[PDB]
């Protein structure tokens, strides 16, 4: 019956069945627009209607109703099927994504520059990296179990400026956008020694996470928790060691890392504070002293106390490694360039 036929919109709605009790709580099909390749006036009889599917005027004479020969129509249908299958194949094929820390992990994956700001502000210089994606659920009074995405992202320009943010959203892409847009308004600035590492060893505890970061020479690489490697590449740090003890909570790790890297005393700050030259003694440069920083104000004439024995609170891991008693089958392994 002609009168019982419906439209493509309604048919696809019913067939796909997106809305429904199943989709209510998750208790596949692809919408193909069948009108894409069709041409007005093209039917299985191969009629050539002047002005609809063929040129109206041919060499100055009004064309007339004609019909393609059977072989010509077969050729046309073959070409149509060829186009259909080419389109389907190009739809099915997918581009290989560049994985982050693992093939199926959102962590470490780039998100691109933060969205441009209103007042002529652009962050093309910044890169964004996902540090975590969670599916947090909250039981609501009416809508049973409610699914949401909490994303942690870190943005940075590779020149010290780096920040991080948490985005909440029902949709993963909205979460990404929220997080990476909020990050750029919460940028730290990290002082890098010689633009490749940190100014001194940093041992800190944020909540139950301990981060022990060691300043390292050029070319040492980033031997850090993978998330710390990502955040350091964003900040602009090339060379550093880092051990994460205690809880490895990603958010506490990120926040404590940023706190430590933001609360570090540069050599100029130390020289100004203690009114003395700060002298670097590199084993590669022999006994040559290298004044890295000098006080802006007057320099103390007092040579500072020479404490015979320091009172520093040493770390057993550092002491054991120095003494060579730490024989771990997992330390100093060979790993890809970081």
């Amino acid at each position: 019956s002609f009168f019982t036929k419906l439209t493509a919109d309604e048919l696809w709605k019913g067939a796909l069945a997106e809305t429904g009790a199943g989709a209510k709580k998750g208790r596949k099909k692809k919408r193909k627009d069948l009108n894409r390749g069709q041409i007005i006036g093209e039917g299985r009889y191969g009629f050539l209607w002047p002005g609809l599917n063929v040129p109206l005027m041919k060499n100055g004479a009004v064309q007339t109703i004609a019909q393609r020969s059977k072989e010509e129509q077969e050729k046309v249908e073959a070409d149509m099927i060829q186009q259909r299958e080419e389109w389907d194949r190009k739809k099915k094929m997918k581009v290989k994504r560049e994985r982050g820390w693992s093939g199926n992990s959102w962590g470490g994956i780039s998100l691109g520059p933060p969205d441009p700001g209103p007042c002529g502000e652009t962050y093309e210089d910044f890169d964004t990296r996902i540090l975590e994606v969670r599916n947090v659920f909250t039981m609501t009074a009416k809508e049973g179990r409610k699914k949401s995405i909490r994303v942690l992202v870190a943005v940075g320009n590779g020149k010290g400026a780096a920040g991080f943010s948490i985005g909440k959203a029902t949709d993963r892409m909205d979460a990404f956008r929220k997080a990476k847009n909020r990050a750029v308004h919460h940028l730290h600035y990290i002082e890098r020694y010689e633009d490749h590492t940190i100014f001194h060893d940093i041992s800190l505890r944020f909540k139950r996470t301990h981060i022990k970061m060691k300043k390292q020479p050029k070319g040492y690489g980033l031997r850090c928790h993978r998330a710390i490697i990502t955040i350091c590449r964003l900040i602009g740090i090339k060379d550093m060691y880092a051990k994460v003890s205690g809880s490895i909570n990603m958010l506490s790790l990120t926040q404590g890392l940023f706190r430590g890297l933001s609360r570090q005393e540069t050599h100029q700050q130390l020289a100004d504070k203690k009114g003395l030259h700060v002298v670097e003694i590199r084993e590669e440069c022999g006994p040559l002293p290298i004044v890295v920083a000098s006080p802006r104000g007057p320099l103390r004439k007092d040579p500072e106390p020479e404490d015979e024995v320091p009172d520093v609170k040493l770390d057993w891991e550092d002491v054991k490694t120095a003494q060579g008693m730490k024989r771990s089958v997992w330390s100093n392994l060979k790993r890809a360039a970081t």
Binding site: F2, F3, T7, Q38, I40, G51, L52
Partner: protein
């Protein structure tokens, strides 16, 4: 929950025309009728025939101007003249619009034994009354 001819709310990305935006209870209150004929007046006849003709005309025009109708047709009946006022899109070529206008007029006239006119009003894109 009433579902009849209502475009349910969404995230605000769904464009809807004036007709779609209005539920059934707004007929004669905020929206008119898409087919005007004397079949449904008191003491008049052939309401069923007029309804069947209207349904067929709507399907035929939808299939004859595919992807061109920017809004529902308006079927007016005056005497035996049938006028189809159709809002369409400025995508198809005018040659094809004219070909199809002549074609539809002639075919419908011969099919329903009555003079049929087809008035096309073209718009750049579907007119959006609101975003649901």
């Amino acid at each position: 929950k009433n579902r009849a001819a209502r475009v349910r709310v969404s995230k605000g990305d769904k464009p809807v025309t004036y007709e779609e935006a209005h539920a059934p209870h707004y007929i004669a209150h905020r929206k008119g009728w898409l087919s005007l004929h004397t079949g449904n007046l008191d003491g008049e006849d052939h309401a069923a025939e007029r309804t069947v003709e209207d349904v067929f005309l709507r399907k035929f025009m939808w299939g004859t101007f595919p992807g061109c109708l920017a809004d529902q047709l308006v079927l007016k009946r005056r005497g035996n003249q049938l006028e189809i006022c159709a809002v369409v899109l400025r995508q198809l070529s005018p040659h094809k619009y004219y070909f199809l206008v002549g074609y539809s007029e002639t075919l419908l006239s011969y099919f329903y034994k009555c003079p049929v006119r087809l008035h096309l009003q073209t718009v750049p894109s579907k007119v959006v009354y609101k975003y649901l």
